[PDB]
Amino acid sequence: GINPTLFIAQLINFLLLIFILRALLYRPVMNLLNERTRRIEESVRDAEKVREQLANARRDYEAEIARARQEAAKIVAQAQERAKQQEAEIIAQARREAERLKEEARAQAEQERIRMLSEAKSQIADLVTLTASRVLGAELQARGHDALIAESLAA
């Protein structure tokens, strides 16, 4: 036979053991859960980490191209400034060095040519060597009358 009292005592002991084991293992189960299952939030934190790694880098690259366009604008602006500086420097004095001299040289040529034409000594230097040149081989027999001989160099 089987004693009912022994079975009841065994059942009570088993229930007490189950309760004590559950109470003692609730802490280890919670610790293991917090240690292991929490890492899903760690994975989404890795996702946020890559998101923040690309985010600030995007603005960094945007500023990297912004400085490039900014310096390009300044370079073009100063190229225009140099263009307007040199163009103004190659008109006002360029004409003075190009077209002013163009008639200044002619003016001085006129000033020297009028002196040359004023050289009546050169006018009388020739017109006498032409004697004994295909005509009138003798030195002089018409006495060199200057009624019209002296009249020359109309210009």
């Binding site: 079975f7 002991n13 802490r27 189960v29 293991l32």
Partner: protein, 225 residues
């Protein structure tokens, strides 16, 4: 009154309480030592019970954990030196004033009293939680539901009745058979002969301790479903 199985059950209770208190005394990440062993065992059992049914794996887990941690240590206590030899005396080393040399250390599962407790508690567990979320359809016999479906619906009910009986009987039978085999092989040759049976006994005890919880959870799964 009490027997010599109850004292070993109490010493197993003390051992389990001491191990659990030592494990829970210092709870921190990266376990190493006894707490690591206990955590690994508990998580392996958790996965094992998840494989059958993941809905109730987090609900009936402490019950099966206690069942395993008690039956395993009770079975292992039977192979320890001194078991079956220490006599309380109310041939036998207690030959003078002979009292059959009652063994002080008797394995907890080697009786018909303790082992029937887990069987009846598992029976009331499957009956309770089976009726928890099924109503009358839990133990429904399906009388002529699909052509006299009552006949099969009736023969299955007695199987449910004898399943705790079968579990308790198998636990007691294997534990007692192991103990008697150890005693007999000790009597035959006192040294170096029961070596294939010493390791066989502890392996069988552990295997039956695990299979008790496995079978109870399987019955719970096939009960709710």
């Amino acid at each position: 009154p009490i027997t010599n199985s109850f004292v070993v059950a109490i010493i197993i209770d003390i051992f389990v309480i001491a191990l659990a208190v030592a494990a829970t005394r210092n709870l921190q990440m990266v376990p190493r030592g006894l707490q690591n062993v206990m955590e690994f065992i508990l998580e392996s059992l958790y996965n094992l019970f998840r494989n059958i049914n993941a809905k109730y794996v987090a609900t009936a887990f402490p019950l099966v954990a206690t069942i395993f941690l008690f039956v395993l240590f009770g079975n292992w206590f039977g192979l320890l030196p001194g078991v079956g030899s220490i006599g309380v005396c109310h041939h036998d080393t207690c030959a003078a004033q002979g009292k059959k040399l009652v063994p002080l250390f008797r394995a907890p599962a080697a009786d018909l009293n303790f082992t029937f407790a887990i069987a009846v508690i598992s029976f009331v567990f499957i009956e309770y939680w089976g009726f928890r979320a099924l109503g009358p359809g839990y133990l429904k016999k399906f009388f002529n539901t699909n052509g006299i479906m009552s006949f099969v619906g009736i023969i299955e009910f007695i199987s449910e009745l004898v399943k705790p009986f079968a579990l308790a009987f198998r636990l007691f039978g294997n534990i007692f058979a192991g103990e008697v085999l150890l005693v007999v092989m000790a009597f035959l040759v006192p040294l170096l002969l029961p070596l294939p049976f010493y390791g066989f006994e502890v392996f069988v005890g552990f295997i039956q301790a695990l299979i008790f919880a496995l079978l109870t959870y399987a019955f719970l799964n096939i009960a709710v479903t």
